[PDB]
C-alpha cells in the first residue's frame, strides 16, 4: 500500500489537497474481515471505522480465517499506525461473502440486494476482489450490475480476474459496462523479483480484454503485486506471499488493485463533494479516473491494460460534464474547451448504459460517439487511434477517448453524438485533462 499510494498518486491527493475520504462510505463484499466483530478486538485499520459489518456466507460470522477481505479493505481504507488504504478516513460496510466452505455461498442470487443493502447503510462505492472466469461474457450478474448502477448513485467496482496473459480472460461481473474493471500493473517492491520491478509492467496474471463481444476491459490498471496490507488475526501464511509482521502482510491478485481504486474514488468523490461543490455520478467518476490515466506503454486500444494506469492527482482536477443533459438518437451535444499546448489533452466520454440481455452477441445498447475538432479543423472520433483519426467509429464501448499528444493551443470543439439509442434518452459524463 504505501508504495501504490506514490504509484497512484494518492500521496499527492493527500498531502496537497487533503484528502483522505472523510465523509466517505465504502463497501466492500469479500471473505470476511479479521475477527468479524465491530468493538475493540477489531484490527486497528479498521477499528472504530466500521459503518457496518454483516455475515452473509455464515450466519452470525463475519471473521477472516482466509485474510483475502481483510487485505483488500485494509488497501481501500485501513488506518493503521502504517500500511494504510488510500483513503484511511473513510469509514467501511463490509459484506461478509465467505461460506463455511471457503467459497462465496453469501452472494445474493440477484446481486442488486448487495448493492442495495450497501446503499442503505450509506455506502455510495461498491468494490469487489471477486467473479467467475468465464472469458468475457456477460452473465445475469453483469446484467444486474449494469441495472443497478444506471438506476443507482453507486459506483461498484470488480477485479478483472487473474487468468492472463492470455486476451480474452475477463471475469464476470468484471465485463458489466457500468462497473470500474481493475487489472492489475506491478507494484514497485523489485527485492522481491520480476513480479514486483516494473510500474509499467501488466502483471502476468491479470486477466487481459477483449470482452466476449470485443469491449476494452479492463477500464484502468493498479499495482496489485506484492502489497503489503493488513493481515487478518485468524489468517495463516499459506495466505499471503509473504510475511511482514503480527498486522499486515503481503498479497498479490487483481484483488489487490481493485481495492486500491476504490479507495482512490473515495479521494476522488470527497474532493468533488467538498472541493468542487457537486456529487459526481458514477459515469463521471470513472471517466475522470479513465482520463486521468496513464499508458504504461503498450498503447491504445489495448485489453492487457485498458485506459491505463490510475494517476489521481490528474483526476482531481477534470474539467468535467456530470450527466447534466440526456440525448436521443440523432441528437448532440456541444462543449468547447480551450487547451494549452504545453501539455497532453484527453477526453473521456463514459455513460452507464441500459443493461444488456445475457443472450445479446452484443452488449451496448445505447451507442454514443465522441466527435473532437482542434482549432486548425482537425477531426477526432472516440476510440480511433490510428491516424486518420476520424475514420473508426466505435459501437461496442460505453468508454470512448480522444488523447492527443501535442495538443493546439486554442478551443477544442467536443460532440457528443448519439449515433442510435433504443432505450433512451441516455446521459453521459465527460472527463477532460490539459
Ligand atoms: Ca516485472
Ligand atoms: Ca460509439
Ligand atoms: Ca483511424
Do not use: C
Not at 118 to 128: E, K, M
Not at 148 to 168: Q, S
Not at 347 to 357: C, E, G, H, K, Q
Amino acid at each position: 500500500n504505501d508504495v501504490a499510494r506514490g504509484i497512484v498518486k494518492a500521496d499527492v491527493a493527500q498531502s496537497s489537497y487533503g484528502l483522505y475520504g472523510q465523509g466517505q462510505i465504502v463497501a466492500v463484499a469479500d471473505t470476511g474481515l479479521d475477527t468479524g466483530r465491530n468493538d475493540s478486538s477489531m484490527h486497528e485499520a479498521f477499528r472504530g471505522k466500521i459503518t457496518a459489518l454483516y455475515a452473509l456466507g455464515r450466519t452470525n460470522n463475519a471473521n477472516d480465517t482466509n485474510g483475502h477481505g481483510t487485505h483488500v479493505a485494509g488497501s481501500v481504507l485501513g488506518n493503521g499506525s502504517t500500511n494504510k488504504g488510500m483513503a484511511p478516513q473513510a469509514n467501511l460496510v463490509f459484506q461478509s461473502i465467505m461460506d463455511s466452505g471457503g467459497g462465496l455461498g453469501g452472494l445474493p442470487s440477484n446481486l442488486q440486494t448487495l448493492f442495495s443493502q450497501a446503499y442503505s447503510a450509506g455506502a455510495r462505492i461498491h468494490t469487489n476482489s471477486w467473479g467467475a472466469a468465464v472469458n468475457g461474457a456477460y452473465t445475469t450478474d453483469s446484467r444486474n450490475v449494469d441495472d443497478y448502477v444506471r438506476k443507482n448513485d453507486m459506483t461498484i467496482l470488480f477485479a478483472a480476474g487473474n487468468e492472463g496473459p492470455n486476451g480474452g480472460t475477463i471475469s464476470a461481473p468484471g465485463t458489466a459496462k457500468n462497473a470500474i474493471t481493475v487489472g492489475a500493473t506491478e507494484n514497485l517492491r523489485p527485492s522481491f523479483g520480476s513480479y514486483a520491478d516494473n510500474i509499467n509492467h501488466v502483471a502476468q496474471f491479470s486477466s487481459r480484454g477483449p470482452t466476449k463481444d470485443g469491449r476494452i476491459k479492463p477500464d484502468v490498471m493498479a499495482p496489485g503485486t506484492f502489497i503489503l496490507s493488513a493481515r487478518s488475526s485468524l489468517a495463516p501464511d499459506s495466505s499471503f506471499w509473504a510475511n511482514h509482521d503480527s498486522k499486515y502482510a503481503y498479497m498479490g491478485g487483481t484483488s489487490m488493485a481493485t481495492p486500491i481504486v476504490a479507495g482512490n474514488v473515495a479521494q476522488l468523490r470527497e474532493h468533488f463533494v467538498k472541493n468542487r461543490g457537486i456529487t459526481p455520478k458514477p459515469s463521471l467518476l470513472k471517466a475522470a479516473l479513465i482520463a486521468g490515466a496513464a499508458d504504461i506503454g503498450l498503447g491504445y486500444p489495448n485489453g492487457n491494460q485498458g485506459w491505463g494506469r490510475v494517476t489521481l492527482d490528474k483526476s482531481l482536477n477534470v474539467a468535467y460534464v456530470n450527466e447534466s443533459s440526456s440525448l436521443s438518437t440523432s441528437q448532440k451535444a456541444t462543449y468547447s474547451f480551450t487547451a494549452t499546448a504545453g501539455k497532453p489533452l484527453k477526453i473521456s466520454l463514459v455513460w452507464s448504459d441500459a443493461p444488456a440481455s445475457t443472450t445479446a452477441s452484443v452488449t451496448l445498447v445505447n451507442d454514443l460517439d465522441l466527435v473532437i475538432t482542434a482549432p486548425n479543423g482537425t477531426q477526432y472520433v472516440g476510440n480511433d487511434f490510428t491516424s486518420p483519426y476520424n475514420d473508426n467509429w466505435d459501437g461496442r464501448n460505453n468508454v470512448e477517448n480522444v488523447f492527443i499528444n501535442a495538443p493546439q493551443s486554442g478551443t477544442y470543439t467536443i460532440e457528443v453524438q448519439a449515433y442510435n439509442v433504443p432505450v433512451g434518452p441516455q446521459t453521459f459524463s465527460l472527463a477532460i485533462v490539459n
